[PDB]
């Protein structure tokens, strides 16, 4: 059956699986961590997020703004 | 609502499942084919001649 995208994001939330979030292309950073929550706008909150460029810094618990996500992969 | 301009018949709340079923209705297809045959026939059959600019 059809698995809607908010259901897949909530699945990623509920099994606490580590995701990797691709941002806009000319920004140049990807963020890796576990999704804790979201809204209807696809803005997400991540716990123990580590950004990497294209070994990277730790960020703590960020609110990634949902205007900027391209792709959320596990 | 919706209104089939070719058909000349109204319709209730414009849902794509009603509208798409109208747009492949056999009677709508006859009305549309008549409309476009007549409009192509009118633009072929219309002899518009250039205005005459008679010099002395």
């Amino acid at each position: 059956a059809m698995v809607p995208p908010i259901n897949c994001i909530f699945n990623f939330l509920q099994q606490q699986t580590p995701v990797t979030i691709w941002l806009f292309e000319q920004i140049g950073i990807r963020i890796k961590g576990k999704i804790v929550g979201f809204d209807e706008f696809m803005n997400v909150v991540i716990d123990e997020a580590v950004e990497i460029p294209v070994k990277g810094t730790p960020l703590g618990k960020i609110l990634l703004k949902g205007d900027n996500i391209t792709l959320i992969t596990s | 609502r919706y209104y089939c301009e070719y058909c000349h018949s109204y319709l209730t709340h414009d849902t794509l499942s009603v509208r798409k079923s109208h747009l492949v209705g056999k009677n709508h297809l006859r009305i549309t084919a008549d409309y476009y045959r007549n409009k192509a026939r009118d633009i072929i059959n219309k002899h518009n001649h250039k205005r005459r600019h008679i010099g002395k």
Binding site: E25, Q26 | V24, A33, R37
Partner: protein, 186 residues
């Protein structure tokens, strides 16, 4: 463009031939990967040290915001008149002219006619029981008939029959006005 997916008979889809395909001419702008507004937008803490002083020494005091104070004037008017209406509205055991006998016997009738008389108001109210006192209310600033009155019946069961009868029937037909009736409410 030889065999058609269109429902119309091949006759009708000879009419809907497109134009020939569009010629290819190379693009003149930035591709979709490289499209961005300018990054390297520099900071703003540079401005606050030097250039802010060169702004303030040129324009030391700002212009008056007069449309703002027109809004301020209407807001002071609303607040002030609310305070005065509250003061005069708050300040019935010290109204004398409503200080007759027990209150359940006193019926309130309002929207009474402007040119009416206390005698014909008495004749109307007496039909539902004996009245003890009447007092039509007049404006204390100038004695325009206020259109409301106080009618004291001898008993509260007699008073509530006048309310029932002459109040629920659309208004007691007095002179040329319909005066609805209820309890004293004070």
């Amino acid at each position: 463009m030889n065999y058609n997916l269109s429902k119309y008979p091949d006759d009708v889809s000879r009419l809907f031939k497109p134009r020939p395909p569009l010629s290819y001419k190379r693009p003149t702008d930035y591709p979709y990967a490289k499209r961005q507004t300018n990054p390297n937008i520099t900071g703003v803490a540079n401005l606050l040290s030097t250039s802010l002083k060169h702004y303030m020494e040129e324009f030391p005091e700002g212009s008056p915001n007069n449309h703002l104070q027109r809004y301020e004037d209407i807001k002071l008017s609303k607040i002030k008149n609310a305070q005065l209406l509250d003061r005069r509205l708050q300040n019935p055991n010290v109204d004398p002219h409503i200080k007759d006998t027990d209150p359940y016997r006193t019926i309130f009738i309002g929207r009474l006619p402007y040119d009416l008389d206390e005698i014909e108001l008495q004749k109307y109210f007496v039909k539902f029981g004996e009245i003890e006192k009447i007092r039509i209310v007049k404006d204390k600033i100038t004695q325009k008939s206020k259109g409301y009155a106080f009618i004291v019946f001898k008993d509260p069961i007699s008073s509530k029959m006048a309310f029932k009868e002459i109040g629920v029937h659309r208004g007691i037909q007095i002179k040329d006005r319909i005066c609805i009736v209820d309890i004293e409410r004070g």
